[PDB]
From Swiss-Prot, chain A:
The species this protein was found in: Mus musculus (Mouse)
Other information: The sequences of cardiac and skeletal muscles are identical.
Organismal lineage: Eukaryota, Metazoa, Chordata, Craniata, Vertebrata
Induction comment from the UniProt entry of this chain: Induced in stimulated quiescent cells.
Interval of the full protein contained in this chain: 162 to 211 of 284
Job of this protein: Binds to actin filaments in muscle and non-muscle cells. Plays a central role, in association with the troponin complex, in the calcium dependent regulation of vertebrate striated muscle contraction. Smooth muscle contraction is regulated by interaction with caldesmon. In non-muscle cells is implicated in stabilizing cytoskeleton actin filaments.
Protein name as annotated: Tropomyosin alpha-1 chain
Domain topic, free-text comment: The molecule is in a coiled coil structure that is formed by 2 polypeptide chains. The sequence exhibits a prominent seven-residues periodicity.
Family in the record: Belongs to the tropomyosin family.
Localisation per UniProt entry: Cytoplasm, Cytoskeleton
Domain of life assignment: Eukaryota
Residue positions where Phosphoserine is found in the record: 13, 25, 45
Subunit architecture: Homodimer. Heterodimer of an alpha (TPM1, TPM3 or TPM4) and a beta (TPM2) chain. Interacts with HRG (via the HRR domain); the interaction contributes to the antiangiogenic properties of the histidine/proline-rich region (HRR) of HRG. Interacts (via N-terminus) with LMOD2 (via N-terminus) and TMOD1 (via N-terminus).
Length: 50, 50
């Protein structure tokens, strides 16, 4: 119970971290979608310009 | 940017060709007046020779 309760806290903290990594990797992927759309739109602007 | 510079290099090729064409055409049309003047003088000299 204490091994699984402290590991429940580790696993809740690792859920908070796994979720934080879901949010951070999703948040960064979404930032990259914006960076990507920005450089894709700049590329389309430069490609249209070129 | 290289295509902006090519826009200029090609525009410069047009400008240079426009100047070279204006010279070639002006020289051709002037030289064609020298053709017609020499030719007319040749006909007049032939009328005199006749």
């Amino acid at each position: 119970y204490e091994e699984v309760a402290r590991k429940l806290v580790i696993i809740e903290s690792d859920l908070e971290r796994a979720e934080e990594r879901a949010e951070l990797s999703e948040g960064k992927c979404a930032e990259l979608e914006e960076e990507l759309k920005t450089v894709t739109n700049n590329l389309k602007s430069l490609e249209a310009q070129a | 940017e290289k295509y902006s510079q090519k826009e200029d290099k090609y525009e410069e090729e047009i400008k240079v060709l426009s100047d070279k064409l204006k010279e070639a055409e002006t020289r051709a049309e002037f030289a064609e007046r020298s053709v017609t003047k020499l030719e007319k003088s040749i006909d007049d000299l032939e009328d005199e020779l006749y």
